[PDB]
Amino acid sequence: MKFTVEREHLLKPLQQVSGPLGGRPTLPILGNLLLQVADGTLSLTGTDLEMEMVARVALVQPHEPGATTVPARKFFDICRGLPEGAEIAVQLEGERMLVRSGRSRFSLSTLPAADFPNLDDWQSEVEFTLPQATMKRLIEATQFSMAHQDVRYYLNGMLFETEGEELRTVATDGHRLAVCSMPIGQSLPSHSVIVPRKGVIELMRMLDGGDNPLRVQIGSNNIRAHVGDFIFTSKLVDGRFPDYRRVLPKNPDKHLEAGCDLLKQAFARAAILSNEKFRGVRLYVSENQLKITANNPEQEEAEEILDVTYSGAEMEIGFNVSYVLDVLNALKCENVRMMLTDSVSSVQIEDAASQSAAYVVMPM
Amino acid sequence: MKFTVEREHLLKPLQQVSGPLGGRPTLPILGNLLLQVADGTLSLTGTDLEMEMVARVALVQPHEPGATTVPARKFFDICRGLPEGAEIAVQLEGERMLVRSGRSRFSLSTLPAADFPNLDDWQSEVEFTLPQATMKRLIEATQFSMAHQDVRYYLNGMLFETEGEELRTVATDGHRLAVCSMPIGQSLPSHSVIVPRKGVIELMRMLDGGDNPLRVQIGSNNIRAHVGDFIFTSKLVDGRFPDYRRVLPKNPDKHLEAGCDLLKQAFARAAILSNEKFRGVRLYVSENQLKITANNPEQEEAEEILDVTYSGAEMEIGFNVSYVLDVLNALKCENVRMMLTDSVSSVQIEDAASQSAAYVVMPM
Ligand SMILES: O=C(Cn1c2c(c3cc(Br)ccc31)CC[C@@H](C(=O)O)C2)N[C@@H](Cc1ccccc1)C(=O)O
Numbered sequence A, B: 001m002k003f004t005v006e007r008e009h010l011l012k013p014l015q016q017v018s019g020p021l022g023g024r025p026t027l028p029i030l031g032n033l034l035l036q037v038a039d040g041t042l043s044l045t046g047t048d049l050e051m052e053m054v055a056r057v058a059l060v061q062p063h064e065p066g067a068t069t070v071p072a073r074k075f076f077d078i079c080r081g082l083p084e085g086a087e088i089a090v091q092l093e094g095e096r097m098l099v100r101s102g103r104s105r106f107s108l109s110t111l112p113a114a115d116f117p118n119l120d121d122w123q124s125e126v127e128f129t130l131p132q133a134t135m136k137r138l139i140e141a142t143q144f145s146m147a148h149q150d151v152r153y154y155l156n157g158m159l160f161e162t163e164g165e166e167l168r169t170v171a172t173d174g175h176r177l178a179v180c181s182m183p184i185g186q187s188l189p190s191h192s193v194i195v196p197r198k199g200v201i202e203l204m205r206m207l208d209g210g211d212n213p214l215r216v217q218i219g220s221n222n223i224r225a226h227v228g229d230f231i232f233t234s235k236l237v238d239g240r241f242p243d244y245r246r247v248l249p250k251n252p253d254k255h256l257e258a259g260c261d262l263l264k265q266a267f268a269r270a271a272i273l274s275n276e277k278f279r280g281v282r283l284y285v286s287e288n289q290l291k292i293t294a295n296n297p298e299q300e301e302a303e304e305i306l307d308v309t310y311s312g313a314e315m316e317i318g319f320n321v322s323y324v325l326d327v328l329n330a331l332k333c334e335n336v337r338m339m340l341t342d343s344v345s346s347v348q349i350e351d352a353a354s355q356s357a358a359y360v361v362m363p364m
């Protein structure tokens, strides 16, 4: 194996395939990247046995086919630490990989490519394409509502659901829920799968924000995303994800509209004097007015009064202010609509201007 | 006690005094700020029993004298979360402190001011003033060479030495040393004190890069710095500091000059394949050339060759790369000079264009 590649053609591929690579490999060789030269292309692979990231780099300079594996972090750091414009010449030399550029030289240890885990081929059952912006919107709208449990917990991940012409994400921890649906202009079979937290992070991380659209393939137990010259594959989480349709409040007839930024600032101040563990605040809704109160075991008290648009019946309701703040911070919009029923029912929150995301928060 | 002040006249003082407090107060009241109204002034004080931070704010609006203490972070967080231009109206009501602005209202718990630890008055023995930029330079030049939690408690601080018309800092951990001297235009008595790590951090933090000069007063067991209407006081470390004049190479015959960034990047690359515990690299110096090599126990090897300015006998010498890189990162200059004697002697490193900072690193 031999190749020479200009540094800035190697750097982004290395960064995308390296990470993670999350500190605790279950086999030593998983701390290495797999390098493969074949048919004019250098392929770079990183994996933790569950997810896999593969980058392909076209080789325009002289090269020789073959494969090896080298420590990912060290190889990345050597390439990154070389100056702008550096040509990076690599050759396999026995049990070492030699890296040369200018008058810099590095001999890295290798482990055989034949020993690197090769994840089984699988068959896609659903495929679609979408703009990167749409995927980014879907994830950012819901990601914060996933449970923070052990890795295999069924709610520690994001439901991805295809239905008609839309892709939908759902995330929940059993107390609050986020759901976002976006049309993608292709009619799709009914299907839903759970992508683990770590998979969700990589789907986001692979979005550069450019011309390149995203191509997604979903199988029985895996999902695959292609963008430009990169392919990411993740295992799915086994589990029965809850039905968001059953958690939306049936008749959230009482509608309050407020400026998102003023509402957020008011909740943020009140939160300071809320119970540090339970984070409870009380909302008092009345005609064109919202009153937010908080108190804590030290008998400290906060009160905020805001003008809002509201003309239904008065009511009082308790919420976890962190959950409410998470929603307002995810919305990043001018006005918010809070859709209320009564003191013992959940609230549904939406950008006043768009129903494409909804958030459900249970009262305390 | 009552006062009303604009948010923008309260925020900086609160940040100055409360910023240093951090989590884990050693006694509950040390989590509180002391507020005192007297003679048309609000004073705000935070302490950990050894250092103390006091800011004075002039009260132009109606006020009433008195004192209380309130949780520092909560009061600061409330003041910061209020909008720009908020009038902040404060009133003591029993064992609670009332804070009101617009339609935001808060009630904080108090602890009596009479119970707030008052640090003893002490007498100034050496006084001088200097620009903030100068103090910043002196600390940044040397801070990284301070020991970290060494049993030789005296090495965990920074020496401040007055000699002639210069203020000097020195820091060393027993393996490397940094010294910086700057003229300040006053005839100073010859004197030196050790400021503890936490005191150095606050000295740096209180700098704002405005026109306000820094006024320093040194006592037998304390130091005070005034900038504008802010006063920081720290205990000194009672111990005997090394004499930097004994550590500087007496006769470093071999001078090597090099681009700082080039040298730094070469060392940084070679460091990747240095022993992870001992971080040894070797330098081979010859006519206008420096070769750097690193190897580790897995038989990985790096080599870097640089064009540098050097005429003199050829020599080899080993260094901890981290110590060399710390210096090169501290210098922030175009060219560096390394002053060498032989393989068993320390090296002195300086900016090639200024002798105001010097660094000594022992060979391996
Ligand atoms: O029983 C339920 C009903 N439930 C449930 C979910 C949920 C989401 C929202 Br926004 C409101 C109510 C929801 C989503 C998780 C559902 C499940 O059992 O898989 C149960 N919730 C538990 C919370 C909980 C259930 C399972 C796991 C964690 C927390 C409770 O409030 O006692």
Ligand SMILES: [Ca+2]
Residues within 6 Å of the ligand: A118, A119, A120, A121
């Ligand atoms: Ca495979």
Ligand SMILES: [Ca+2]
Residues within 6 Å of the ligand: A179, A180, A181, A355, A356, A357, A358
């Ligand atoms: Ca929706």
Ligand SMILES: [Ca+2]
Residues within 6 Å of the ligand: B118, B119, B120, B121
């Ligand atoms: Ca005092």
Ligand SMILES: [Ca+2]
Residues within 6 Å of the ligand: B179, B180, B181, B355, B356, B357, B358
């Ligand atoms: Ca000096």
Ligand SMILES: [Cl-]
Residues within 6 Å of the ligand: A261, A262, A263, A264, A265, A266
């Ligand atoms: Cl507000």
